[PDB]
Amino acid sequence: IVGGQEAPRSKWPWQVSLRVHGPYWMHFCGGSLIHPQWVLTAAHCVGPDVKDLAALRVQLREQHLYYQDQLLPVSRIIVHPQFYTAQIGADIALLELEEPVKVSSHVHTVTLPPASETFPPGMPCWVTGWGDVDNDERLPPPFPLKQVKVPIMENHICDAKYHLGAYTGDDVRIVRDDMLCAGNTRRDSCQGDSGGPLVCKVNGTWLQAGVVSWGEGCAQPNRPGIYTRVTYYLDWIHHYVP
Numbered sequence: 042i043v044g045g046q047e048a049p050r051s052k053w054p055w056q057v058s059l060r061v062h063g064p065y066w067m068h069f070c071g072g073s074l075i076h077p078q079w080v081l082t083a084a085h086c087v088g089p090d091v092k093d094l095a096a097l098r099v100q101l102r103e104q105h106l107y108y109q110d111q112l113l114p115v116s117r118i119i120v121h122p123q124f125y126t127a128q129i130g131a132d133i134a135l136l137e138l139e140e141p142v143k144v145s146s147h148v149h150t151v152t153l154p155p156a157s158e159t160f161p162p163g164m165p166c167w168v169t170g171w172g173d174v175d176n177d178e179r180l181p182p183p184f185p186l187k188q189v190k191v192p193i194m195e196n197h198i199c200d201a202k203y204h205l206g207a208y209t210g211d212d213v214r215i216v217r218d219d220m221l222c223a224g225n226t227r228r229d230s231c232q233g234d235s236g237g238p239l240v241c242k243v244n245g246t247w248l249q250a251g252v253v254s255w256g257e258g259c260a261q262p263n264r265p266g267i268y269t270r271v272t273y274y275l276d277w278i279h280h281y282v283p
């Protein structure tokens with residue numbers, strides 16, 4: 042997370058950390074709890090190549106990475122079948138936990154948006170994670186969960202931005218309809234936040250608008266952060282999640 046601050050302990054009870062086996066179980070992506078047994082994340086965190094489930098664990102909301110881990114194994118990794126690269130799209134995946142977790146005020150699910158919600162510029166939205174705090178700058182110990190409020194940019198304006206300083210013809214769409222843009226040169230997600238949630242408060246309820254997906258670096262001019270647009274994948278999600 043670039044900009045913003047440490048999250049208060051009561052916030053973002055759905056945030057999870059994805060861990061890969063090594064000298065220690067290291068954080069490499071975010072996710073969100075959408076059902077007591079299911080985690081939503083980015084396909085690029087776990088694909089397109091099939092990896093060994095044994096080498097993956099999920100950590101539910103904690104204030105600091107690593108201190109008091111309770112790591113959870115995964116029974117299934119379901120990756121959207123359209124996925125092969127983040128720039129193309131369908132950058133979305135589901136992890137089924139081996140057990141359903143218990144929920145409380147401290148750890149619970151996020152609400153998914155209705156098919157119709159567009160998330161227009163000016164909506165209050167936050168992205169959260171334990172990712173880089175600037176380009177090639179990791180989150181320092183003790184690894185607090187960070188949050189930042191990010192401004193939504195309409196897709197067409199984001200797409201135009203992405204064409205500035207680029208050779209790509211204006212009619213070749215880079216920022217696609219199944220994607221969403223947010224952030225600026227002071228506020229953004231970054232490497233290590235991938236797969237985590239962008240949430241917007243709508244009529245008093247937090248809805249997950251986006252999954253952290255890609256962008257050119259972090260907080261760079263004319264290069265807002267790009268998120269998988271959750272509304273586009275609701276039917277797919279509901280094929281697996283009760």
Ligand SMILES: NCc1cccc(OC[C@@H]2CN(c3cccc(C#Cc4cccnc4Cl)c3)C(=O)O2)c1
Binds near residue numbers: 209215229235
């Ligand atoms: N700040 C959000 C965020 C969050 C999490 C991970 C993030 O990046 C992870 C990786 C790094 N990377 C990347 C690296 C270098 C250059 C480019 C570009 C471009 C471009 C420019 C103009 C027109 N067309 C195009 Cl395709 C893309 C990317 O795409 O994914 C970003």
